[PDB]
């Protein structure tokens, strides 16, 4: 069932797109990039002070990408939020539009270009990623209502493939405190106050009620439960939204044909993880770590796994080990058929990662892009 005539579904570990009108059904791949800004105080994708928004989408497509993960915050999706940081001289058709109208315009145009869009509820506020899907201030029912409103609106755009429920569930304290102190996300504690896996079924079910044709992207947490995390030597060193070690024993209960697990994984430019030390076997020790944290969900369990974020400076003003790290990760994704992904980020203005575009928001980093395009064939 679909309001657009397009229906998305997971068969095995492959995402398929169905056109109910022509009857066409083909598998699709997501060669994506994250274009952020709608989750920041700007309330609009960044770079429009230097580029025309349409030109940005065209350039993204020209490089072989066919998908964009679009992060947003609660404020950006409500009527009337004023965006800041747009050169209207370059973006005349954006004059007088609120953030919601600009998002609509961008998504509609991305569709004309054949670019898929994944909506990502990145932050409740607009300044940072919260560890849980609710705060002292904002309840879970508010979170879900925000999603319901977003789904009823954007569900009408054919190229929107679904929802990445919550960006990077994580913890702010250490374990074992973290598993019960209630300040962070968990998985398999059988505790509804902090179990992201239990939360995902709830949020996801609400969204599917209004957008049945959508896919539901579920990220990992940081820590899961002490049994799971302790059963692996690097079980306490997974990235925020990067721990899917608990999926085996605690699958997320959403229809199999709608669920997509979406882990995040980073390099040394983001955090100097202990396993990045050469004396620890870096980078040849990585495949097994990636396998344990999330790879097995696809390779062993057969689920669709779409890396939601990964990136780094690739040696440009950053830790030189990051070049090796990205080269190794892409090697591994290609070998193991992790064909769907979203790179962080299209934007060059990411403090610890830089992006595909250089600081001038116009030219790209050739070596970084040449490594990544191996995934695009
Ligand atoms: O996940 C992105 C996030 O990582 C933060 O570092 C964490 C890391 O995720 C975790 O695996 C490690 O064990 O602890 C560190 C410190 O919290 C990093 O600080 C953020 O900048 C980054 O966005």
Cis peptide before 283 (omega within 30 of 0): yes
Contact 33, 65 (CB under 8 A): yes
Tokens representing 188 are 């398999």
Ligand 1 binding pocket, CB closer than 6 Å: 237-240, 266, 270-271
Q: Atom 13, ligand 1: which residue's CA is nearest?
A: 237
- CA dist 69 and 160 (Å) reads 10
Angle at 226 (CA atoms; ends 254, 182), nearest 5 degrees: 75
Q: What is the dihedral of CA 371, 311, 224, 184, to 10 degrees?
A: -170
Q: Alpha helices of the chain — where are they, by DSSP H?
A: 53-62, 99-112, 140-154, 177-180, 196-210, 226-230, 286-290, 296-299, 321-335, 366-372
Q: Which residues are catalytic?
A: 168, 309
DSSP 8-state class, residue 238? P
DSSP 8-state class, residue 361? S
DSSP 8-state class, residue 372? H
Tokens representing 176 are 């074992």
- CA dist 182 and 39 (Å) reads 25
Instruction: Round the CA-based radius of gyration of the chain to a whole number and report it.
Output: 19
First to last CA, the chain: 33
- CA dist 58 and 163 (Å) reads 24
Determine whether the annotation assigns residue 168 to a binding site: yes
Q: What is the dihedral of CA 375, 35, 276, 243, to 10 degrees?
A: -90
- Tell me the structure's resolution in angstroms, rounded to a single decimal: 1.9
- Ligand 1 mean position, distance from CA 263 (Å): 14
Q: Report the topology of domain 1-377.
A: TIM Barrel (3.20.20)
Domain boundaries, the chain: 1-377
Determine whether the annotation assigns residue 269 to a binding site: no
Give me the residue label for tokens 């509609």: 108
Contact 293, 238 (CB under 8 A): yes
- CA dist 49 and 56 (Å) reads 12
Angle at 355 (CA atoms; ends 352, 357), nearest 5 degrees: 145
Cis peptide before 47 (omega within 30 of 0): no
Q: What is the dihedral of CA 148, 151, 153, 155, to 10 degrees?
A: -150
């Amino acid at each position: 069932q679909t309001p657009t005539g397009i229906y998305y579904e997971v068969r095995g570990d492959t995402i398929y797109m169905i056109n109910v009108t022509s009857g066409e059904e083909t598998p699709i791949h997501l060669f994506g990039v994250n274009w952020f800004g709608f989750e920041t105080p700007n309330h609009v994708v960044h770079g429009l002070w230097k580029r025309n928004w349409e030109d940005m989408l065209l350039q993204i497509k020209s490089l072989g990408f066919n998908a964009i993960r679009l992060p947003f915050c609660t404020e950006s999706v409500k009527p009337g939020t004023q965006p800041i940081g747009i050169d209207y001289s370059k973006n005349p058709d954006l004059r007088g539009l609120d953030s919601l109208q600009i998002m609509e315009k961008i998504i509609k145009k991305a569709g004309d270009l054949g670019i898929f869009v994944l909506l990502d509820y990145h932050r409740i506020g607009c300044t940072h990623i919260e560890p849980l899907w609710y705060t002292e201030d904002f309840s879970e029912e508010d979170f879900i209502n925000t999603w319901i409103e977003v789904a009823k609106r954007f569900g009408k755009y054919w190229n929107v493939i679904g929802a990445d429920l919550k960006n990077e569930p994580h913890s702010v304290t250490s374990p074992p405190a973290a598993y019960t102190d209630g300040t962070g996300a968990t998985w398999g504690m059988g505790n509804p106050a902090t179990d992201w896996n239990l939360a995902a079924e709830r949020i996801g079910k609400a969204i599917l009620k209004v957008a049945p044709h959508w896919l539901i992207f579920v990220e990992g947490t940081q820590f899961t439960n002490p049994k799971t995390d302790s059963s692996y030597k690097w079980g306490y060193n997974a990235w925020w939204g990067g721990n899917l070690m608990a999926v085996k024993d605690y699958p997320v209960n959403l229809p199999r044909n709608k669920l997509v697990y979406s882990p995040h994984v980073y390099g040394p430019d983001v955090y100097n993880q202990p396993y990045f030390g050469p004396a620890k076997g870096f980078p040849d020790n990585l495949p097994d770590i990636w396998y344990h944290h999330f790879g097995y969900v696809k390779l062993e369990l057969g689920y669709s796994v779409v890396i939601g974020e990964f990136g780094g400076k690739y040696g440009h003003g950053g830790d030189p080990r990051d070049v090796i790290w990205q080269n190794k990760l892409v090697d591994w994704m290609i070998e193991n058929k992790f064909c769907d992904f979203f790179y962080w980020s299209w934007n060059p203005d990411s403090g610890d990662t830089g992006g595909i575009l250089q600081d001038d928001w116009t030219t790209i980093w050739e070596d970084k892009y040449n490594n990544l395009k191996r995934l695009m064939d």
